[PDB]
Amino acid sequence: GETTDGVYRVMTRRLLGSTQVGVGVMQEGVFHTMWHVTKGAALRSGEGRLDPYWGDVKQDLVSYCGPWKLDAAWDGLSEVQLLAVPPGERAKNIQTLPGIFKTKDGDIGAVALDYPAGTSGSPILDKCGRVIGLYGNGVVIKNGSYVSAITQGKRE
Amino acid sequence: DMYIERAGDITWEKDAEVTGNSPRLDVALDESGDFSLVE
Numbered sequence: 001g002e003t004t005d006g007v008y009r010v011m012t013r014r015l016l017g018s019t020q021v022g023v024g025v026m027q028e029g030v031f032h033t034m035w036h037v038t039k040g041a042a043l044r045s046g047e048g049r050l051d052p053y054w055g056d057v058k059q060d061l062v063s064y065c066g067p068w069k070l071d072a073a074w075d076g077l078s079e080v081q082l083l084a085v086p087p088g089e090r091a092k093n094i095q096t097l098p099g100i101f102k103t104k105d106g107d108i109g110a111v112a113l114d115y116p117a118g119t120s121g122s123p124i125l126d127k128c129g130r131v132i133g134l135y136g137n138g139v140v141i142k143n144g145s146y147v148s149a150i151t152q153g154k155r156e
Numbered sequence: 157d158m159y160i161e162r163a164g165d166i167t168w169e170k171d172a173e174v175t176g177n178s179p180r181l182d183v184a185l186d187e188s189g190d191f192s193l194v195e
């Protein structure tokens with residue numbers, strides 16, 4: 001299939017038309033997305049098939065064809081960019097300063113950008129271009145607006 | 157059955173649109189991987 005590094009849409013025909021359920025990153029032969037996008041299901045790329053290798057419902061992450069590859073982290077300070085890939089619309093960089101998810105286990109980056117569900121899995125970038133996690137699991141605030149964690153996995 | 161379609165390169169685009177705020181929130185994470193506002 002297409003094994004080229006970069007960002008992808010995740011489509012199903014199981015509903016009406018071709019419906020974008022999410023986004024993911026191909027890097028070093030491995031596809032990364034959020035568990036709630038695929039539910040662990042296998043993926044088609046050309047004739048090529050992509051089979052799940054690692055996942056965790058609680059982290060809401062899943063890799064295909066190999067172990068999780070993305071190790072870079074938000075530094076707590078600098079601005080970032082959501083490389084947002086919405087349904088039927090072109091990939092598009094938003095620059096933003098992340099807020100914080102404060103949790104009984106620790107603190108995580110939060111990006112307060114409001115985008116459809118089918119955008120879940122779009123990657124978050126540092127200034128060097130490295131992916132520091134994925135947008136699309138989070139929380140609805142007082143306003144009615146949406147705020148996402150920066151979700152990153154571990155690399156062995 | 158699901159399939160993937162390439163959407164672009166992973167690049168920082170200088171003079172990208174700059175917006176959204178930076179809120180500090182107290183949140184819980186359940187076993188289902190759902191976040192929720194602790195207040």
Ligand SMILES: Cc1cc(OCC(N)=O)c2cccc(C)c2n1
Pocket residue numbers: 036114115116117118119120135136137138139140146
């Ligand atoms: C990108 C995204 C994802 C969501 O839910 C999925 C998740 N697990 O956070 C959303 C839920 C409600 C409203 C909006 C605007 C959402 N946007």
